[PDB]
Symmetry: D2
Subunit: 310 residues, 4 copies
């Protein structure tokens, strides 16, 4: 059974202009990440535009990633959907594709409750009991916060193998790590931060890895950062993290007075990837807004200056 620790980017989905999955570019991106030093891949996560792809498109992207990865690193599959029956359909797809782990959120659109969230995860686990199931804490998208007491209960019960926490709340992540360790659940329950700019903080508190969207652009930077942290080189880690945080400025280029943070952020990532020659274009799924030729030039300049070298 695969173990999901270390640097595990949420793989993006390159697209053609007509919105279909750009399989050739997706293969190039997978190679970019693996040869960049990542420890695993998270397919069909938020930054993979999972919420934008149809079920059929998700299946194609997942299969493309798993087949091209060819066992080099483990691949975990997102099963993001509103409620349990719909998530379990995606679990079946994931098993069919040979996924080595699952990533699920709380229910959304519907009102929910900690009791119902817990049942949700238990029933997802039961659909694929041999796969490590990670709980994806992402309040900006699902509008629930995953109760840390519930998570540790499910860890103890063997229902959850870990969590990917994208709440942006490092104090809360730290508290969860401390609670986990005090409960003696350190080895059983992996804690991955979704942070792109406070990865050194997470490792200093004893987190097990990172799922950074920006890791699509600069996988080598995050690999190098994790290595510094694991070697206890905290000052050096902080200096590298600061440079990564200046690369991160690509997500702030797009004018959010007329587009969402997804358009600006994921668009900035894809723009960088196209500039680096990894994918064919920065095409986005509907209804994402395009970046202007001026915005893309600014993104290029940032990439040129702050992409990691060593």
């Amino acid at each position: 059974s695969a173990t999901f620790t270390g640097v595990i980017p949420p793989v993006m989905t390159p697209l053609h202009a007509d919105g279909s999955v750009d399989v050739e570019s997706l293969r190039k991106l997978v190679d970019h990440l693996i040869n960049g030093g990542v420890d695993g891949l998270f397919a069909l996560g938020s930054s993979g535009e999972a919420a934008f792809l149809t079920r059929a498109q998700r299946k194609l992207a997942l299969t493309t990633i798993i087949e091209h990865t060819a066992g080099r690193v483990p691949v975990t599959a997102g099963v993001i959907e509103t409620t349990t029956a719909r998530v379990i359909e995606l679990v079946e797809d994931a098993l069919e594709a040979g996924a080595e782990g699952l990533v699920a959120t709380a229910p959304f659109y519907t009102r929910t409750h900690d009791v119902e969230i817990e049942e949700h995860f238990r029933k997802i686990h039961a659909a694929a009991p041999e796969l490590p199931l990670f709980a994806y804490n992402i309040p900006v998208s699902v509008h629930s916060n995953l109760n840390p007491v519930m998570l540790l209960t499910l860890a103890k019960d063997g229902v959850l193998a870990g969590t990917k926490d994208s709440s942006g709340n490092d104090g809360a992540i730290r508290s969860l790590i401390e609670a986990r360790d005090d409960a003696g659940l350190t080895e059983q329950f992996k804690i991955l931060t979704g942070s792109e700019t406070t990865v050194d903080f997470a490792y200093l508190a004893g987190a097990d890895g990172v799922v950074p969207g920006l890791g699509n652009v600069d996988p080598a930077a995050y690999a190098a950062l994790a290595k510094l942290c694991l070697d206890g080189k905290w000052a050096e880690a902080a200096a590298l993290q600061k440079r990564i945080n200046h690369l991160f400025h690509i997500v702030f280029v797009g004018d959010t007075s007329h587009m969402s943070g997804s358009s600006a952020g994921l668009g900035g990532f894809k723009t960088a990837l196209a500039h680096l020659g990894i994918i064919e274009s920065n095409a986005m799924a509907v209804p994402h807004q395009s970046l202007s030729d001026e915005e893309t030039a600014r993104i290029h300049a940032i990439v040129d200056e702050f992409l990691y070298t060593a």
Copy 2:
């Protein structure tokens, strides 16, 4: 070309204990509503547990409703999904089933923006330009508020035929009606309230109809209320609305210390329907919680006292 005004309940989905669609009970429910005097049916809305049903189950419920209705009243179809491509798949299902209208929300899960919401509705309309498209304002579930200026812009362009507003903000609904009328868009853009307890207010302000979940339980009450409002009998309407609001107490019976508002509310509705002999049981989709015997007895008592009598 079908016109969606008047009392248009969001039809529930009766279920078997194994979670499958209870087709026989769904047919009985359809007759209950139509014989109760409603003016149309909204299939695959929030109260139909659309977020809980798989795409295949949605297709079964929609087809069951349309075929049993047999043209007695028009049927509009929810196409609720996270983003545009996924919504358009459901539009395709709706056309295949012979739906006579469409109901869509803003994008959700993903971050969004008014610019992206507008593009979303335009693209949905383009997928079925001959069907009336209604915008469904439901901030509690999608966590965007539909910009009323954008809605009227889309109405003027023929993209939107109306809106179903479940925001619970009657001042905002009133302001939108006023702006519509001042823009000369009164006939082009129907405004339906999703309110169950302030339907008289909406009609007094010139709304075109109502989409009340409780209308599943007591369609005759809402038909009677609409008629009083249409006849300008506002005092009589307020007295009936007050009685309806005491029937509505069935949604507050379930103890929300261990269940969601959906479990308590929709569970309350289904418990009432089962008590009235319209559907086989109050089975809910996973991960809804069950109501206790004490809770169902309280629901029965409320139904007995406050169900409509002329």
Copy 3:
């Protein structure tokens, strides 16, 4: 003791350019309101810029209002402050000035809880047990919602004489009225809406009165509206409310891309009052932003068109 029902505007505070209270204009405003047919005055409410006035300035405004009113209508006094001891200081001021009622909010700035909100109101009441104490529900400013069950508990105990509800949620106001009536607390606990645009709705549901900011500008319109409602002329009431709602557009003139809603809204009211010759100028307390000549011209045109004629 005085009874606070009917039309009770939150009296504004006219200012000199240096920010001091314009006593002469405040007297003219009091006459404008009373001769406009109002049933009471609410001094030192939100629309009175209570949050902007020093304790000394509040005392001056309050005393000016009470003395010029000369017993023509009852005056209730805001005691808006963060927590209980600070509120009780203002209760002492109100007693000194001869106020005939008190209006208090939940605690704010500090984190709070329903248990603490309840204690807060009990302690305020204990400082002036012979004055009617109204609870001011204004979540946009205090970021708590007053629990309706708590409110009725305090009503039964004789702690609260009523509530002024500015939540903008007419469904919730209606539910509270229904709960009050079902508990047999109709006479004991007055329910006043802070709505400016859905006053007819509130009266239809059996509210006792209205505290409308726009009532400063057009007291006669709200007096006329209340009378129509009390006479059961609901269609005529709705028509008049619609005209009032177009007068209300004065609050939307100010460019909120460079001011607050308070600058645009209260500024709009003061601009209208200056236009009507009631107050010297539209001077606002720091840090409100000023309205442009273009904006004031637009406000003047709206006032000319939609002001009520008795």
Copy 4:
């Protein structure tokens, strides 16, 4: 002019049973903090129950603190109030008492706007231009977030001397520090975290200090933590922060089913009474009291995790 960096706790206000300021306990607390190694004191902040104290009580508490401090460390004064004119009254009080700095928030209760927030701070500055003015970012209480571009504009203009950030968002604080340094405003604009449990993170990112409520209870722990961070001993710092974070469990003892202020500040005062620094854990109205069982639990946490 005073420099507000390092460990600067928001001094609590001990009370008598009737809610009046307990000046003898307040003096003992001030000594507790100063002898515990803090670098400054923040009087009349949120943890000082400033929102609960009347203007007259704030004056008494501030005077008591400044006089007992007797120049040993600098004292900055909170001037927390809804809007500008009311804040400036408090600025006048602060000058009268001899405060050496000011801490202000955005306007609250009233709706506001970045334009009005900026005018607010400029006018507060003009009322006492020789005092360092720190902007207090505390969205949980004022329900505005201070715009970091605005803060740096004000820093460049000499209106703001710094910020105390209690948003709990370490990524956002880090971004502000980076933006400050990139704009060449490092020396002019001090950035202090209000975090109690991620102080080492803040120092790793180059923050100038910390304003921790729990620092009332264990000033020596935070003084030791800051020293480790300044010495670049990050592994040792993280280990000490972890211990501090277990002491912090005292704020989670109170049953919040019947506020966080009651549980949290009540937890602190319970610890201070247990340590003999203040007379009792009396809280301002309408705070709820902690039960015997709850105070016993707080005592046990203090006994185990207090820094030695």
